[PDB]
Symmetry: C5
């Protein structure tokens, strides 16, 4: 959403400032060779490399977690069918909580209003309990645990099979903490701070130190070099907001729709 074709052509210009500036240079006692900029440029590419690595890892973890939502809810619906196929009332109740959980987890991470979706899926008295909590999504898990918890007290599930389905609720519980953790723990600011400073300074001092060698090609190369360090420093911030609505963020709404369609395929609806 924020772009830097601004600094690629501030480069083209601060490259042109350089060529005309050349002949008043050694006058002052100012020369700039590339060798120390090779040193720094390489030290920055190493550090850009490790950083982007962290950024990609955390994006992959965000996708893994949403992946698990689809898996655990798929299999918990399957277990309900295979263990209690008479029980379509309980089927339909548990399914609306599991769908509610995903929608509510999307809203929570986008900081939007789950109320419409919650009301689409759940009794109004259930919606009230969920929204009264300071942790609505976690309160949805508690309610689904009640559905199977009473199926247990009613003897329709044993402690064994109660256990098989509880574990899926633990899986979702790990997804929720995981998303909360990812959403409140960015890659430390120092990294992107330090890097965005040095990648910036280096990208505009570069056409200076390149002028002695390349003279009047300083722009077509000091740009090429700068774009490379910038399309690589940008791929970073394009990968550390996984839950947003931007283009390269995760399509959470589409994944929530896939989760809902999946569970309704499994229950006829």
């Amino acid at each position: 959403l924020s772009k830097i074709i601004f600094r690629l052509l501030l480069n083209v210009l601060m490259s042109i400032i350089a060529i005309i500036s050349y002949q008043w240079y050694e006058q002052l006692g100012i020369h700039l060779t590339v060798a120390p900029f090779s040193l720094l440029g390489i030290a920055i590419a190493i550090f850009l490399g490790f950083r982007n690595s962290a950024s990609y890892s955390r994006f992959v973890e965000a996708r893994n977690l949403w992946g698990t939502v689809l898996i655990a809810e798929r299999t918990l619906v399957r277990q309900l069918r295979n263990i209690l196929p008479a029980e379509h009332d309980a089927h339909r109740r548990i399914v609306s909580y599991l769908v509610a959980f995903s929608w509510s987890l999307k809203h929570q991470l986008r900081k939007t209003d789950p109320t419409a979706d919650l009301r689409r899926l759940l009794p109004e008295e259930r919606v009230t309990e969920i929204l009264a909590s300071s942790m609505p999504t976690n309160r949805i898990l508690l309610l689904a645990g009640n559905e199977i918890g009473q199926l247990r007290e009613a003897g329709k599930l044993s402690d064994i099979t109660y256990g098989l389905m509880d574990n899926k609720l633990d899986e979702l519980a790990h997804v929720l903490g995981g998303c909360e953790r990812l959403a409140t723990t960015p890659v430390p600011f120092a990294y992107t701070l330090i890097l965005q400073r040095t990648v910036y300074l280096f990208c505009t001092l570069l056409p200076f130190a390149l002028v002695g060698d390349l003279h009047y090609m300083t722009p077509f190369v000091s740009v090429f070099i700068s774009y490379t360090f910038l399309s690589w420093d940008s791929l970073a911030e394009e990968l550390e907001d996984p839950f947003g609505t931007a283009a390269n963020d995760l399509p959470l709404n589409a994944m929530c729709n896939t989760i809902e369609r999946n569970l309704l395929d499994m229950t006829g609806q």
Copy 2:
């Protein structure tokens, strides 16, 4: 690939004969800045190829679980219900149908022939109705295990032992689906394959000042190295890609089918 090895050799033959009208005008290309650019690109290609490898390893691992989980499920059926061969046959069908259906799912090819060969056509049209056929095959396998439980042939404990194996497959389905809907860079593997593509053709212009008539040779050696590394990343990054090698995906569904018929003594021929 080798079309861009020869776009290079001629970009360099261009570079030598045109080198004459170069600093007639003041247009200098050292090799020191192009070595800072190259080392940087080579560093990023290192990390990029490192992430592709990991996607490739995870796909191989997920397919490994299919073989593992299906084998231990069938071993459990035999060990716990050694008499129930009709159930053995039915379940072994769905497991085999799951593997093939998954492979067809990932490579976006038609599963109908493999399903029609494995399953009763009532279940085949049910499976082909679902927008999630592989999931529906797992669901059907589950009803088999559940019926043995309703019938009292499986206890809740032993029903549970087999349920776990179906979970393992559930994880494999989603893992594979996640690994396919991606990439995660979007079109930034777009930008880096052209950043390499540009560098590799600007390069002989920068080298000609140092090597004259030999720059077609040293700049194609370098280009091959960079484009080989890059293209290797392209291949690893899309492990179920249409432009992939189906040998192991095919070999894997064939191994598991073979193993399973063996385990249910449908081999050898009497």
Copy 3:
């Protein structure tokens, strides 16, 4: 940061450089950059791996604290779901769990737990806990006795007792995981052979730079020492993630979250 002493100090070492330059010719000291390129790149490579190792320690520490919140959340869920009427047990257990995480934060910060312990538990138990040389483990054992009594009371079966037992196991893994990241630091050689060689590289770098950039030398030398020394000290910050630096973990915020969570509505559930 605390860098700005040395980033300053470097500009005056880079000054001593330029007011003893042409004085080089007389004294016999040639001093090129390409050896300091080599030395610089090796230090960058080694700083790259050091910093990677430190982030891993940060990330694992953050995950361990994530699990406290997860495991404690789902343990209260199980109690609310299996023994829904047992509010005296719910509140007793919730208090130990909140005791557990505050007690852990004090343990890793080497501060006194007694305030928080008393805010939350009976003082007979506040003294049982401080009596133990391992108080967080003692809190775990107490939470296990509540779980265990409910089982001798016949309110939990063996199955449902195990279900809750496993969550206390999960927290025993957080405890040991944190003790390992605390009591096992990174080896000390890694920390100060590496920080002497980076500043030593920083205070000599201009003496070899002064020949190529003349006056420009304090600029580029300080640019380069910034890049190097900010990277090194970020590494030493994340290496100690239970510490109190600006990039360490917010352990107090995280214990409040756990607390607000388990006591969501004075502890009221549907």
Copy 4:
């Protein structure tokens, strides 16, 4: 092996100093800076490649380590749960030992028949040898032992399950070894790397010679040793079930296993 390519390189370096006579007379000139670029690139790729090979080696050693652990504790549970069934003890142990040797034979593409025959009845050997996967069949037979103890009421479903889990663990080891064996990366890793490390090594002296003159062969083999030795160790580590120097001592590993399992069931090697 590697010292033949080292030898061919010092010869290539002599061909270089000799034919330096006719260099610009034949219209050539080769600087070092281009080869430092190419050379650092190859170093970086070799560094990552090598890292991947070591990972495979550690995973292969890991999987074998789990055979020992799982088999140890399966025997531990038989003794703790059924202290009286010494015949089950000896039959399961002979399968668990049969499993290990067969796994070795499998991964080494050799014949298990001797070892099988040493350890089991011939009616079993024939059943095992009939299988597309003998190790699978051995796991299934070990599974019958504990499964028959369960039909006899000597094992509950719970305690049958506990031991079944260990057989499940051996299944995973088998799968993982089978996956580490039938999954070499596309030779692209070897062809791109091995031939370009070869090719770079042999043209390095032609580019070193203008700078170093008679010193060419000394520095040119030092650089060539470093790269080749690095590349060649990568190739040993990536096939860890082979018979090379750095390859898992699978026979000793099997004897340690048999030694262990015989030691736990009161017998003497």
Copy 5:
């Protein structure tokens, strides 16, 4: 920590190199710094990756020992919460658990466990244990039948016997993992290749540096040699985590911590 002899050899190497620089032209030897950039950078990359593998072995060792303290703690917590009356079996099992960790320590350090073993066990069992070529495994087998006895004595259900069996399984994986780290060392070719090339690089380096640094090379080259050599030997001080240096795992401390923890959880 006799890197310092290697660096003083390096100062002599550049003394020799400055002294010898005259007869360079005469003898026809040309040494630029550029091919040594290439080689040194390559060595750095490989040293970086190698050192990284060494760190990862050290960390796996510490995690393995971390699991001992965790698994033994929660086994004892389970015994107290499930069988709070049976303090006779608590003490039996705790002494088997504490025996395991001391026996593991001595096993990895190739020392005599008899002192700690007889300090904790009746000789009725200590001689059984040391008659085995796998003592620590046998201590696990012995802890196992304590649990098994309780089960067959009806005091444990299959379910609760199961719950504790899983913790013995955890200790089994620690045993296997530690043994695996001890017997399977990091491939020795790593330290050969690298000790050679790093040492040879550090001595050949002044002969390439003096062309352009003249009387300064003793300094610049001892620096570089200090960086490489000390990085390389950090990797080696990390590759044997079960050793004896203060650099290594304080296994005695960890075993004392484990003993105190399990004794404290029982009163003693």
